[PDB]
Design a protein around this ligand. Structure first.
Ligand SMILES: *[C@@H](O)[C@H](C[C@@H]1CCNC1=O)NC(=O)[C@H](CC(C)C)NC(=O)O[C@@H](Cc1ccccc1)C1CCC(F)(F)CC1
Ligand SMILES: *[C@H](O)[C@H](C[C@@H]1CCNC1=O)NC(=O)[C@H](CC(C)C)NC(=O)O[C@@H](Cc1ccccc1)C1CCC(F)(F)CC1
Lengths: 297, 299
């Protein structure tokens, strides 16, 4: 099943941020609140905002930050790329051990979707090769964050800013830099051609086998390069030797050599699933990493 | 449409571990009571077929190790209610949310916080199947993990995890210790009924497709509830109840499509197939999104 990290450590950091008639979510760590900078915009501003110009015209008191019932007083503000940093007079006692990371395409993370500073739901996402994410975000979800948890440490990797015409989503790392060629302006933006995350499809095929589902296997094999030629033809990402190494544990667990599973995937790509299903899906799933599969099986 | 779990923090604040001897599982700490599966009192060998009453008679408060993290919670009373143990502890959980215990119906969905040794590992959304199993992800040590819904501020606990069936699916109790389905907490082979498709949820999914502009399958006809139920059963679909018709009300009102007209549309899909088409980007009809899940995600 698609499993997210427990969201409690992040819930304790969500607040509401309002400027004018614009409300969204912020992330309160220690005495700083992080949020998308387009909170400072009006309707007119959003088409071609000059953010540095808009921000110098703002005072601390134009920012209304609420942690539940309690307003937090803003005593400082700065902008780092597409993120606004609001210094507040009080520290969050619920601040977890945390870091800010920038994730790579193909990696997965959990999203805590929030509205008006209140958590609504949690789900698992992957950073697509074209640097979009297939999220579930509505009006008011900006400032929702994505994260992974290791031991007691929350690694924040994503802050939500926008939806594209196709319905997929785009956002930034916590330094305010977009993933992908996108801009925080109210304009229709296309992404580059997406590709399928091959190492993740293979991991999920291994998961299907670990759960006793093996109709798709075969006795053929393939070289790494010959598989990569077919993959690219079908708009699948190439598989590196590191990807092969990272699948080792799953190969050992099942006794199916990585390149043998590549041969299975090749046959699926060339012939399709013939109305069949794998782990209940009519489509090859590519948003489980090898680590996700291992951690859960 | 994503499988979206509830935020898990209010439940994370209630997870503890319970150990008897070397048997450890998870428990749920609310106020000054810890709830857990009663088979914590079994040796691995007693699980073959345990006599729980006799096993518990030999137990005292001081045989139970309850820990929140590595901090011990002293047990001051114990009792067994059906298949759950209730351990009274000397500290009221400061993180107790507003809560209730509810018994869910097959087809309803809930979030599971999968825990090991009292530590949450992940959260995911589950549906109770019509045969009273869930298709969970649960490893050794996961028993006592709970399933829940959140309404406003209030956590409704509906599931506590006890066992895995030969087919890989999972079975458990409500928080009063009453199993869902015909299962018992004994380490013996037990078969679920053949499963069926959750009709009310497929209908919810068809309403969601309409809301998003995908409506090629809407037909000109209607049906009675009884005629629909008799046909649906021939395709291994669950019959609808009056409660199902009522919980489809909001989506019916939002789209202007009567419930029985949507049933007629589904009947046609069942009798004629998708004729090569797709709905919401899928050749398969999805049955693990409830009417509430649709509303919760679309609006
Ligand atoms: C929690 O204590 C644990 C969770 C199980 C273990 C793995 N996945 C799960 O969901 N529950 C049990 O171990 C449970 C205890 C009984 C007293 C109810 N027994 C159980 O789940 O048995 C199944 C899995 C298992 C196999 C081998 C060792 C331990 C557990 C068996 C599978 C085959 C069967 F169905 F025929 C009999 C039970
Ligand atoms: C922040 O909460 C919000 C989240 C969006 C809202 C819907 N789903 C989301 O994920 N982001 C924005 O409002 C963002 C603001 C810019 C200044 C960066 N704009 C945005 O996402 O625009 C898309 C969605 C939208 C539609 C209608 C009204 C408001 C927002 C548009 C999609 C259609 C388009 F491509 F033509 C233009 C952008």
């Amino acid at each position: 099943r698609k499993m997210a990290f427990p969201s409690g450590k992040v819930e304790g950091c969500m607040v509401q941020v309002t400027c004018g008639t614009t409300t969204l979510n912020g992330l309160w760590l220690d005495d700083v609140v992080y949020c998308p900078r387009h909170v400072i915009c009006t309707s007119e501003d959003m088409l071609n905002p000059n953010y540095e110009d808009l921000l110098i015209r703002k005072s601390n008191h134009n920012f209304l930050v609420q942690a539940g019932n309690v307003q937090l007083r803003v005593i400082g503000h700065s902008m780092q790329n597409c993120v606004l940093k609001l210094k507040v007079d009080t520290a969050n006692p619920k601040t977890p051990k945390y870091k800010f990371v920038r994730i790579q395409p193909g990696q997965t993370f959990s999203v805590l979707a929030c509205y008006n500073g209140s958590p609504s739901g949690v789900y698992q996402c992957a950073m697509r090769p074209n640097f979009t994410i297939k999220g579930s975000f509505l009006n008011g979800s900006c400032g929702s964050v994505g994260f992974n948890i290791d031991y007691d440490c929350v690694s924040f990797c994503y802050m939500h800013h926008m939806e594209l015409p196709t319905g997929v989503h785009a956002g930034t790392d916590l330094e305010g830099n977009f993933y992908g060629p996108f801009v925080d302006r109210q304009t229709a933006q296309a992404a580059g051609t997406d590709t399928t995350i091959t190492v993740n499809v293979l991991a999920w095929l291994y998961a299907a086998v670990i759960n006793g589902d093996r109709w798709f296997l075969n006795r053929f094999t393939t070289t790494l390069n010959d598989f990569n030629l077919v993959a690219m033809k079908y708009n699948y990402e190439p598989l590196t030797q590191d990807h092969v190494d990272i699948l080792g544990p799953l190969s050992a667990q099942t006794g199916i050599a990585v390149l043998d599973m590549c041969a299975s995937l090749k046959e699926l790509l060339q012939n399709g699933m013939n109305g069949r299903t794998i782990l209940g899906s009519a489509l090859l799933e590519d948003e489980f990493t090898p680590f996700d599969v291992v951690r859960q099986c």
